[PDB]
Amino acid sequence: MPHAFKPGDLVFAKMKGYPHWPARIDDIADGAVKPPPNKYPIFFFGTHETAFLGPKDLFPYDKSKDKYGKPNKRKGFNEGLWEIQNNPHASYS
C-alpha cells in the first residue's frame, strides 16, 4: 500500500497551463527555505525549476508514465523525460 510522499520519489507534477511534467520530491537542505505547510518542494526535470505543490498535483511516475511520458513541444520537457528515466537522483545544480 502507498505511503506519504518522501524525498526522492519520482512523479509527474501538474501546474496550471503546463502538461503533467517529470519531476521529483526534493529534500530541503539545512539552512534553506522550507515549503508552505502541506506542500512539498518539487524539482522539475529538464527546466531544473522548483515549485511547491500538494499531493493533488503529484502523480507517481511508475503508474502515470504510460499516459504522461511522451514528447512535448514545451521547453525543457524532452530533456526532463531523459533525466527522470536515466539519472533521476543526480545533482542538477
For residues 92 and 48, the answer to whether their CB atoms sit within 8 Å is: yes
Identity (one letter) of the amino acid at 10?
Answer: L
Task: Characterize 29-47 residue by residue with b for buried, 16 or more Cβ atoms within 10 angstroms of its Cβ, and e for exposed.
Answer: eeeeeebeeeebbbbbbbb
Experimental technique behind these coordinates: X-ray
Cell numbers linked to 67: 499516459
Closest CA to 64 of 81, 86, 42: 81
SS3 sequence of 43-86? EECCCCCEEEECHHHEEEHHHHHHHHCCCCCCCCHHHHHHHHHH
Query: Residue 49 corresponds to which amino acid?
Result: E
For domain 10-29+37-78, which architecture applies? Answer: Roll (2.30)
In the chain, where are the structural domains located?
A: 10-29+37-78
